[PDB]
Protein backbone atom coordinates (compact mmCIF):
# COMPACT_ATOMS: atom_id res chain seq x y z
CA UNK A 1 0.00 0.00 0.00
CA UNK A 2 0.96 3.42 -0.75
CA UNK A 3 0.23 4.76 2.78
CA UNK A 4 0.61 3.24 5.91
CA UNK A 5 -0.29 3.94 9.84
CA UNK A 6 2.62 3.63 12.09
CA UNK A 7 1.43 2.26 15.11
CA UNK A 8 3.55 3.15 18.51
CA UNK A 9 2.60 0.87 21.60
CA UNK A 10 3.90 1.50 24.85
CA UNK A 11 2.80 -1.52 27.06
CA UNK A 12 1.47 -4.90 25.50
CA UNK A 13 -1.01 -7.13 27.78
CA UNK A 14 1.07 -8.58 30.39
CA UNK A 15 2.77 -11.96 30.52
CA UNK A 16 1.73 -12.35 26.60
CA UNK A 17 4.52 -13.47 23.86
CA UNK A 18 4.16 -11.74 20.73
CA UNK A 19 4.00 -15.15 19.10
CA UNK A 20 1.10 -15.49 20.53
CA UNK A 21 -0.49 -11.56 20.19
CA UNK A 22 -2.44 -10.44 17.16
CA UNK A 23 -3.20 -6.83 15.68
CA UNK A 24 -6.60 -7.08 14.65
CA UNK A 25 -8.00 -4.46 12.03
CA UNK A 26 -11.00 -2.54 10.56
CA UNK A 27 -11.82 0.68 9.38
CA UNK A 28 -10.00 2.39 6.75
CA UNK A 29 -7.04 -0.09 6.66
CA UNK A 30 -6.31 -2.04 3.34
CA UNK A 31 -7.02 -5.28 4.43
CA UNK A 32 -9.51 -5.51 7.39
CA UNK A 33 -8.94 -8.23 9.28
CA UNK A 34 -10.78 -11.74 8.52
CA UNK A 35 -11.22 -15.18 10.29
CA UNK A 36 -11.15 -14.84 14.00
CA UNK A 37 -8.62 -14.50 15.63
CA UNK A 38 -5.70 -15.96 13.74
CA UNK A 39 -5.81 -13.53 10.81
CA UNK A 40 -4.78 -10.72 12.69
CA UNK A 41 -1.74 -9.21 12.02
CA UNK A 42 0.91 -11.17 13.92
CA UNK A 43 2.56 -8.90 16.49
CA UNK A 44 6.16 -10.96 15.55
CA UNK A 45 6.50 -8.80 12.95
CA UNK A 46 6.53 -5.58 15.79
CA UNK A 47 9.68 -4.17 16.40
CA UNK A 48 10.92 -2.62 19.65
CA UNK A 49 11.94 1.07 20.10
CA UNK A 50 12.41 3.52 22.98
CA UNK A 51 8.43 4.28 23.54
CA UNK A 52 7.50 0.18 23.55
CA UNK A 53 7.23 -1.78 20.40
CA UNK A 54 5.59 -0.28 16.72
CA UNK A 55 4.02 -2.00 14.02
CA UNK A 56 2.81 -0.42 10.53
CA UNK A 57 -0.36 -1.08 9.70
CA UNK A 58 -0.86 -0.52 5.56
CA UNK A 59 -3.96 2.11 4.87
CA UNK A 60 -6.85 2.34 2.74
CA UNK A 61 -5.99 3.35 -0.70
CA UNK A 62 -8.83 6.15 -0.41
CA UNK A 63 -10.79 7.59 2.48
CA UNK A 64 -8.09 7.82 5.16
CA UNK A 65 -10.51 8.92 8.44
CA UNK A 66 -10.76 6.21 11.06
CA UNK A 67 -8.83 2.95 11.90
CA UNK A 68 -10.18 0.93 14.81
CA UNK A 69 -8.12 -1.63 16.15
CA UNK A 70 -7.77 -4.46 19.13
CA UNK A 71 -4.82 -7.00 20.46
CA UNK A 72 -6.01 -10.02 20.44
CA UNK A 73 -4.44 -13.62 21.38
CA UNK A 74 -4.79 -17.47 20.06
CA UNK A 75 -6.64 -18.15 22.32
CA UNK A 76 -9.56 -15.85 20.68
CA UNK A 77 -9.67 -12.77 23.88
CA UNK A 78 -10.25 -9.64 23.38
CA UNK A 79 -7.00 -8.34 25.45
CA UNK A 80 -7.11 -4.94 24.81
CA UNK A 81 -11.05 -3.78 23.98
CA UNK A 82 -12.20 -2.17 20.80
CA UNK A 83 -10.40 0.80 19.70
CA UNK A 84 -10.62 3.58 17.55
CA UNK A 85 -8.53 5.98 16.30
CA UNK A 86 -9.58 9.15 14.16
CA UNK A 87 -6.63 10.27 11.63
CA UNK A 88 -6.61 14.08 11.87
CA UNK A 89 -5.70 14.02 8.08
CA UNK A 90 -5.20 11.34 5.77
CA UNK A 91 -1.16 12.01 5.69
CA UNK A 92 -1.51 11.46 9.50
CA UNK A 93 1.15 8.21 9.23
CA UNK A 94 2.04 8.15 12.80
CA UNK A 95 0.39 7.64 16.40
CA UNK A 96 1.11 6.63 20.11
CA UNK A 97 -0.93 4.37 22.22
CA UNK A 98 -0.31 4.35 25.88
CA UNK A 99 -0.95 1.79 28.57
CA UNK A 100 -4.18 3.08 28.57
CA UNK A 101 -5.22 2.34 25.14
CA UNK A 102 -5.32 6.11 24.73
CA UNK A 103 -4.01 7.76 21.08
CA UNK A 104 -1.76 10.81 20.66
CA UNK A 105 -0.80 12.32 17.20
CA UNK A 106 2.86 12.95 18.40
CA UNK A 107 4.85 11.07 21.26
CA UNK A 108 3.28 12.53 24.86
CA UNK A 109 6.66 13.31 26.63
CA UNK A 110 6.85 13.71 30.98
CA UNK A 111 4.24 15.35 32.80
CA UNK A 112 4.65 18.60 33.83
CA UNK A 113 6.26 20.34 30.98
CA UNK A 114 5.10 21.45 27.67
CA UNK A 115 6.86 21.31 24.49
CA UNK A 116 6.91 24.10 22.19
CA UNK A 117 7.49 22.75 18.36
CA UNK A 118 8.42 26.02 16.21
CA UNK A 119 9.07 25.00 12.24
CA UNK A 120 9.77 27.49 9.37
CA UNK A 121 9.50 27.03 5.60
CA UNK A 122 13.51 28.05 5.46
CA UNK A 123 14.97 25.73 8.41
CA UNK A 124 17.03 28.63 9.29
CA UNK A 125 16.54 28.78 12.95
CA UNK A 126 19.81 30.50 14.64
CA UNK A 127 18.76 33.59 16.27
CA UNK A 128 15.17 32.73 17.10
CA UNK A 129 13.94 31.88 20.50
CA UNK A 130 10.86 31.67 22.47
CA UNK A 131 9.35 33.95 25.05
CA UNK A 132 7.29 32.68 28.03
CA UNK A 133 4.83 33.93 30.11
CA UNK A 134 1.69 32.92 31.97
CA UNK A 135 1.68 29.58 33.80
CA UNK A 136 5.34 28.61 33.26
CA UNK A 137 7.84 27.70 36.03
CA UNK A 138 10.13 30.38 34.98
CA UNK A 139 8.98 33.19 32.61
CA UNK A 140 11.51 34.79 30.52
CA UNK A 141 13.57 37.89 31.09
CA UNK A 142 15.33 40.54 29.71
CA UNK A 143 13.83 41.11 26.17
CA UNK A 144 14.26 39.88 23.73
CA UNK A 145 16.34 36.73 25.31
CA UNK A 146 14.13 34.13 25.47
CA UNK A 147 14.71 30.34 25.52
CA UNK A 148 16.82 29.32 22.23
CA UNK A 149 15.56 26.50 19.73
CA UNK A 150 18.45 25.28 19.05
CA UNK A 151 17.09 21.69 19.92
CA UNK A 152 15.81 19.85 16.74
CA UNK A 153 13.13 18.01 16.61
CA UNK A 154 10.54 16.06 13.93
CA UNK A 155 8.35 19.06 13.90
CA UNK A 156 11.08 21.35 13.61
CA UNK A 157 13.22 23.47 16.38
CA UNK A 158 12.07 22.83 19.73
CA UNK A 159 12.24 23.85 23.27
CA UNK A 160 11.22 21.95 26.26
CA UNK A 161 9.27 24.40 29.25
CA UNK A 162 8.38 23.20 32.55
CA UNK A 163 4.97 24.33 33.82
CA UNK A 164 4.01 25.95 37.34
CA UNK A 165 2.01 23.22 39.62
CA UNK A 166 -1.19 24.12 38.87
CA UNK A 167 -0.98 25.52 35.06
CA UNK A 168 -3.63 26.38 33.52
CA UNK A 169 -2.68 28.31 30.86
CA UNK A 170 0.80 29.37 29.14
CA UNK A 171 1.18 32.51 26.83
CA UNK A 172 4.14 32.48 24.68
CA UNK A 173 5.78 34.23 21.23
CA UNK A 174 8.29 33.25 18.82
CA UNK A 175 11.51 36.01 18.24
CA UNK A 176 13.54 36.55 15.80
CA UNK A 177 16.89 38.57 17.97
CA UNK A 178 17.99 38.97 14.78
CA UNK A 179 15.84 41.81 14.20
CA UNK A 180 15.49 45.20 16.13
CA UNK A 181 11.88 47.03 17.34
CA UNK A 182 8.72 45.31 16.50
CA UNK A 183 9.81 43.19 13.98
CA UNK A 184 11.55 40.94 16.51
CA UNK A 185 7.89 39.45 16.91
CA UNK A 186 8.28 37.11 14.29
CA UNK A 187 4.22 37.97 14.02
CA UNK A 188 2.57 40.09 16.58
CA UNK A 189 0.34 37.83 18.26
CA UNK A 190 0.86 36.23 21.23
CA UNK A 191 0.25 32.76 21.42
CA UNK A 192 -2.26 31.31 24.38
CA UNK A 193 -2.37 27.59 25.19
CA UNK A 194 -5.08 26.38 27.64
CA UNK A 195 -5.29 21.95 26.84
CA UNK A 196 -2.29 21.50 29.78
CA UNK A 197 -4.03 18.24 30.73
CA UNK A 198 -4.50 16.43 27.05
CA UNK A 199 -1.29 17.95 25.67
CA UNK A 200 2.68 17.72 25.93
CA UNK A 201 3.19 18.68 22.92
CA UNK A 202 2.63 21.83 20.70
CA UNK A 203 3.29 23.28 17.23
CA UNK A 204 3.10 26.69 15.76
CA UNK A 205 4.82 27.99 12.11
CA UNK A 206 6.46 30.53 9.97
CA UNK A 207 3.66 33.58 11.20
CA UNK A 208 0.27 31.56 11.96
CA UNK A 209 -0.77 32.96 15.14
CA UNK A 210 -3.08 29.87 15.54
CA UNK A 211 -1.07 27.46 18.42
CA UNK A 212 -1.58 23.83 17.22
CA UNK A 213 -2.34 20.94 19.31
CA UNK A 214 -1.04 18.03 16.66
CA UNK A 215 1.92 18.40 13.96
CA UNK A 216 -0.52 18.26 11.12
CA UNK A 217 -1.37 21.65 11.93
CA UNK A 218 -5.24 20.86 11.91
CA UNK A 219 -7.14 23.64 13.78
Known amino acids: ?28 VDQPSKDWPNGAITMTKAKKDDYGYYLDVPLAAKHRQQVSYLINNKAGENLSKDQHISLLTPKMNEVWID ?89 PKDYLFKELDNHTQVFVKDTDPKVYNNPYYID
Request: glycine share 10%; proline share 4%; hydrophobic share 35%.
Open 1 to 28: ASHHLRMHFKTLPAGESLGSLGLWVWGD
Open 99 to 187: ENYHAHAYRPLKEGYLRINYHNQSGHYDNLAVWTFKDVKTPTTDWPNGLDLSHKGHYGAYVDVPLKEGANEIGFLILDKSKTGDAIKVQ
